[PDB]
């Protein structure tokens with residue numbers, strides 16, 4: 758369990774009360790967006806958190822540069838295979854954890870992000886289960 762805190766993901770903004778709409782249950786457990794490997798949606802297909810896929814909502818955006826430091830907060834650091842990052846649904850960067858347990862505070866540096874409005878998807882793959890954790894960040898790159 759864990760979620761991306763900076764730049765804040767959709768479940769982070771819900772849990773911190775930064776959205777102008779009620780997000781439901783996810784507001785109380787942002788660390789729990791868990792779903793089988795292989796998806797590219799913000800919820801991963803977890804039906805209890807379907808609001809995270811609704812793009813009609815006025816989701817807030819974050820202004821960032823093309824090179825940005827991205828921070829996770831883990832509550833239960835499971836042995837990890839890879840951390841995958843997509844930009845608008847297309848794989849951008851991969852980090853290999855070699856099946857090791859990560860630190861509960863973890864920072865990665867993304868580079869070469871395209872300018873304009875985009876949505877990053879962070880996919881955390883657990884090495885000893887069939888599940889991953891899904892985090893979306895809406896951003897404006899300049």
Ligand SMILES: [Cu+2]
Nearest residue numbers: 758759833835
């Ligand atoms: Cu867990």
